[PDB]
C-alpha cells in the first residue's frame, strides 16, 4: 500500500554571509542563554532539526504546516548573526511549537515535549533584557 509522500522542503535558510553584522544584547540572550537551555533539556532531541516528516510518516505535514522550524535552524541562524534582532528569533521559536501543537493531538508525547521546553522558554524570555 505505497503512497507518494513526496519530498522534505530544503531546510530553511541558515545563512545570510552578506548581511551585515550587528549583535544586540538581546541576540546575544537568545543564544548565550535561552538556546543553551532548550537545547540541554532533556525533551530537546525531536527539536534540534527540520522534522524528516517524509521518513516519519507525517501524513499532510508540509500542507498543514507552512514554515516547519526547528531548534537547529535557530542555533545555525544566531551562530551566523542571520537574525537582524531578537523579535525575528523569538518568532521562529513561537513558530516552531505552534507548528507542533497545530499539527498534533493535544495528548500525544510530542506535544508534552515541546509544552516543556516552551515552559522554559518563557521562563527564559521573562528575564530577556532591556535593548
Ligand atoms: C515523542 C517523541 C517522538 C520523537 S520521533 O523522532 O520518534 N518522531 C517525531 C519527531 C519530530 C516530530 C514529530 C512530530 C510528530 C510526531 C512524531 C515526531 C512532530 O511534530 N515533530 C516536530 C517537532
Known sequence: HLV???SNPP???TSNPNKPKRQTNQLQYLLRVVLKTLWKHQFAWPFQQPVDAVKLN???YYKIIKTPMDMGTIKKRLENNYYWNAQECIQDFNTMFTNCYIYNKPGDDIVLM???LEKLFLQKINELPTE
Open 4 to 6: 507518494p509522500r513526496g
Open 11 to 13: 531546510p530553511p535558510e
Open 58 to 60: 507525517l501524513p499532510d
Open 114 to 116: 515541546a509544552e516543556a
